[PDB]
Structure 1
């Protein structure tokens, strides 16, 4: 209730969706209370960090609604670059029918110049669906803290928090 760790989301890449959040220990400092002159510092330096990870959670991503959705549309998660580059041809479409079958074999074009180009879009045919593709994981679920562990038994708790969990049913 008073001293919890900031929760850290565990990942599975090809699915795109994160498994669930967990506490940090292999870098967690000594909690053997040093004295009355440093207890306020070890609880104080952490306290401003709790607001560092709280403020950016609303900035980096829109606040939590569906905590872990597999059926995920693209809005903040970016759809890849939509820009095509189109170039012309050394030979023409209609200036070739006159020669080869008649007699003269063929081997801007320096015979009869023409300018004709057509540009078509490069974008992903229809919008991005499912999990995160390349690298948008940190921008989607930033490490966030629940500072009062399981405060509220039967109504709701940290739900999608568990790695052994799917969105369809609990347990």
Structure 2
């Protein structure tokens, strides 16, 4: 309500694309003090101010035996045991000792993707980045100066995405 101690706005996540959907004022955690006197009402307003101070600030400032993949594996290069190879004479029966070659096997097992991505955001980074945002003087500018990110039906490039096509 008050343009100085405003109820905060809480973002909504779209898991599927990784972008952040529209947000809204928090409407599930409001305190109903409509049956209180000036004392508790001032106390509650001070509490909400403290909460807003916590939010603003937070947001602004805070932004051998390799483990393999959780089960370590040993590593040997000269562990070659069966030195024979079947020439015209020999006939090698069942064999095989699985050993990770130091350079070939391990590096080929831990290479990253060929080219890094460029798109949406995962859940953890969304939680760390999109804290609830406190909007102080709501919509106080001329048309076009409003925060359009809040409306979920608004597309950044093509403005005001017409629902239903």
Provide TM-score, normalisation by structure 1: 0.62
Distance 1:104 1:157, change over 3 A: closer
Structure 1 residue 122: Cα displacement = 1.7
Pick the structure with more helix per residue. Answer: 2
Structure 1 residue 129: Cα displacement = 1.4
Moved more, 104-113 or 10-19: 104-113
Structure 1 runs not aligned, ≥5 long: 77-99
Runs of 4+ residues deviating >3 angstroms: 66-76, 100-121
Provide TM-score, normalisation by structure 2: 0.64
Structure 2 runs not aligned, ≥5 long: 64-71, 83-88, 161-165
**Distance in 2 between the 1:74 and 1:8 partners?**
61
Structure 1 residue 58: Cα displacement = 1.3
Q: 1:19–1:165: 8 Å Cα contact kept in structure 2?
A: no
Matches within 5 A, 1:78-157: 121-133=110-122, 135-157=124-146
Distance 1:28 1:153, change over 3 A: same
**Distance in 2 between the 1:50 and 1:17 partners?**
25
Q: CA RMSD in A?
A: 12.8
Q: 1:74–1:129: 8 Å Cα contact kept in structure 2?
A: no
Q: What per-residue deviation string (whole Å, max 9, x for no partner) do you get for residues 6-36 of structure 1?
A: 1011111120000122111222111416112
